[PDB]
RNA sequence: AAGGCGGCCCCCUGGACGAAGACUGACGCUCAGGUGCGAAAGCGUGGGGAGCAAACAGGAUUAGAUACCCUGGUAGUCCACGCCGUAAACGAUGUCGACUUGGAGGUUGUGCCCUUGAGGCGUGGCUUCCGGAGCUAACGCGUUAAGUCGACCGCCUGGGG
């Protein structure tokens, strides 16, 4: 806002695994107000990843945030005719809560039988460095890097 | 303080290039006399003495010929 | 401003020194001048309304300094 | 080839591009980059970055020729002045000194006029 | 004197200012009509033409764009000699006098001591800024008055036409 300093709010952890940034994926997940729906598909998509690819829930869901998370983005100034952007460095908390955005936005169109399995292929791809959430990382990172003299 | 060529009552002359060494810039530029401190009726002879100098290539132009 | 490195240094000293160098020669504060023509009544409005601007705040130093804020 | 030992390196320098070329120290050129072609045509040619990328273009096609040591020559008051030198301090060449060598008049022709 | 005057050197030349003395002895001030000088643009006859650049041509923006912006570009700007005789030619303030509290400066002579080294003491000529009394419609001016007075000249008499 215009002056204030704002303090988050810390939200409850998950139930399963004790683990708030699980809790947070979640929270973007979840449509309408309804989190009894949205911590099944969660939680039935996990499952899903472990049993396929590794042990270690918390790392198998980890791996595809460290290929998904970016670290410069561009954000728009004027000056006079035409509008040029501008790279920032992302602060880490926008980087872990960015990231999951574009992971359940490339999950909702992926045109699989059901929301657990589109879920379940694209946390696996991005665990192998692929799929949709990481061209989107990789668009930012190469407009941020086409235009970049200005600072 | 100020005072340089206030003791030397004459005429500032162009031969002795080492009192005007002084009065130059290392571009060859002539300072103002807000910095030295020379009064008007001395810095114009200077800049005259000067001009006299560099004529007769006693002095630089410019710092790169 | 020729510069001539002097012996080892770090690049940024002789770099930083050069930069030094140009800003007492004032190159880039002539070329700019020199990058379109003014008109000679223009030339001699601009110096003068300098001057008396430079005058007036040197006065109005003095007002200030005679009164307190609070 | 040729194999010349110490170069000169002319930075011509403006408000709307950058030119950097490479010469010997009798003044016949080896090779030159500039913003313009770089890859930065429109409004980019005229920033401190696309300077120093010409630098580093110019640092290459003068391998066959050996230059190690540079006597830097900057001209034409414009952005990329001085991270174009430093961009050349990047190439590994040790340079030895550092000029200005702009054209300034004292008073010859007349300017353009102004712009409204 | 006003217009105006800017690298360096020479040879022709005008006007200011100061010190201390001599000389002439009212020889003065203003000035209708006249006479002279008078930026830039412009004109005539010869030269010169690098850079700028009216007119002109192309590109762009625009509803249009005979403009602003970009790319080129002729007269002109330069020299010699003649015309033109006008400008917001403006401190929008005619010239010459005497008088009327003060500060901060600049520039240029000087006569003393204290040539005690820097320094202090006084007197003239121009010029910048701030301000007291006074002035006035107010802004403001204010020892270089728009203050208090003389001497001559020029001009003003509702707006448009
Ligand atoms: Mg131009
Ligand atoms: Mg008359
Ligand atoms: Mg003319
Ligand atoms: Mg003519
Ligand atoms: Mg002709
Ligand atoms: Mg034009
Ligand atoms: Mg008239
Ligand atoms: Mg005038
Ligand atoms: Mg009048
Ligand atoms: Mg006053």
């Given at each position: 806002p215009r002056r204030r300093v704002i303090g988050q709010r810390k939200i409850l952890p998950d139930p399963k695994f004790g683990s708030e940034l699980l809790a947070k994926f979640v929270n973007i997940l979840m449509v309408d107000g309804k989190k009894s729906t949205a911590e099944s598909i969660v939680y039935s998509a996990l499952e899903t990843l472990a049993q396929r690819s590794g042990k270690s829930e918390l790392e198998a869901f980890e791996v595809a945030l460290e290929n998904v998370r970016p670290t410069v983005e561009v954000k728009s100034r004027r000056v006079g005719g035409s509008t040029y952007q501008v790279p920032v460095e992302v602060r880490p908390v926008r980087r872990n809560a960015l990231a999951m955005r574009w992971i359940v936005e490339a999950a909702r169109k992926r045109g699989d039988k059901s929301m657990a399995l589109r879920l379940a292929n694209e946390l696996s791809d991005a665990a192998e460095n692929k799929g949709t959430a990481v061209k989107k990382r990789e668009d930012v990172h190469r407009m941020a890097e086409a235009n970049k003299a200005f600072a | 303080f100020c005072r340089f060529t206030a003791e030397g009552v004459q005429e500032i002359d162009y031969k002795d290039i080492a009192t005007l060494k002084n009065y130059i810039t290392e571009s060859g530029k002539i300072v103002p006399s807000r910095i030295t401190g020379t009064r008007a009726k001395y810095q114009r002879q200077l800049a005259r003495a000067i001009k006299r100098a560099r004529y007769l290539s006693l002095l630089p132009y410019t710092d790169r010929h | 401003p020729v510069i001539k490195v002097r012996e080892?240094?770090?690049?940024?000293?002789?770099?930083?020194?050069?930069?030094?160098?140009?800003?007492?020669?004032?190159?880039?504060?002539?070329?700019?001048?020199?990058?379109?023509?003014?008109?000679?009544?223009?030339?001699?409005?601009?110096?003068?309304?300098?001057?008396?601007?430079?005058?007036?705040?040197?006065?109005?130093?003095?007002?200030?300094?005679?009164?307190?804020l609070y | 080839r040729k194999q010349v030992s110490d170069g000169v390196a002319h930075i011509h320098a403006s408000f709307n591009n950058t030119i950097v070329t490479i010469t010997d120290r009798q003044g016949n050129?080896?090779?030159?980059?500039?913003?313009?072609?770089?890859?930065?045509?429109?409004?980019?040619?005229?920033?401190?970055?696309?300077?120093?990328?010409?630098?580093?273009?110019?640092?290459?096609?003068?391998?066959?020729?050996?230059?190690?040591?540079?006597?830097?020559?900057?001209?034409?008051?414009?952005?990329?002045?001085?991270?174009?030198?430093?961009?050349?301090?990047?190439?590994?060449?040790?340079?030895?000194?550092?000029?200005?060598?702009?054209?300034?008049?004292?008073?010859?022709?007349?300017?353009?006029?102004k712009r409204r």
């Open positions: - | - | 080892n240094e770090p690049f940024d000293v002789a770099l930083r020194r050069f930069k030094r160098s140009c800003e007492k020669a004032g190159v880039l504060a002539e070329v700019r001048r020199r990058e379109f023509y003014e008109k000679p009544t223009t030339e001699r409005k601009r110096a003068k309304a300098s001057a008396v601007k430079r005058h007036a705040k040197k006065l109005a130093r003095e007002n200030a300094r005679r009164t307190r | 050129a080896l090779g030159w980059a500039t913003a313009g072609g770089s890859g930065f045509r429109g409004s980019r040619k005229s920033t401190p970055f696309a300077a120093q990328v010409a630098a580093e273009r110019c640092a290459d096609a003068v391998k066959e020729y050996g230059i190690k040591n540079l006597e830097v020559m900057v001209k034409g008051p414009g952005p990329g002045r001085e991270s174009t030198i430093r961009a050349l301090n990047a190439a590994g060449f040790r340079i030895t000194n550092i000029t200005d060598v702009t054209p300034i008049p004292h008073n010859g022709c007349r300017p353009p006029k």
